[PDB]
Symmetry: D2
Subunit: 21 residues, 4 copies
């Protein structure tokens, strides 16, 4: 789920992780 060269999918996965400790 990239948006041009931004790794959107991965950044959201990382946000979910960090939000959960």
């Amino acid at each position: 789920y990239r948006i041009x060269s931004y790794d959107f999918x991965d950044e959201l996965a990382k946000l979910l992780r960090q939000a959960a400790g």
Copy 2:
């Protein structure tokens, strides 16, 4: 939209922004 002190709503907003320039 928070999980304890983490502002999940704002962090998600910041990603949508960062992914959009």
Copy 3:
């Protein structure tokens, strides 16, 4: 924030509200 036919901003906002309700 659009992806084709999706108002991605609004679809995300829906999931936030569905979950927090």
Copy 4:
């Protein structure tokens, strides 16, 4: 990635996937 009984993780994954095809 749950909020109570709501599987946020999975509903997000489904949204991304469906909006990409």
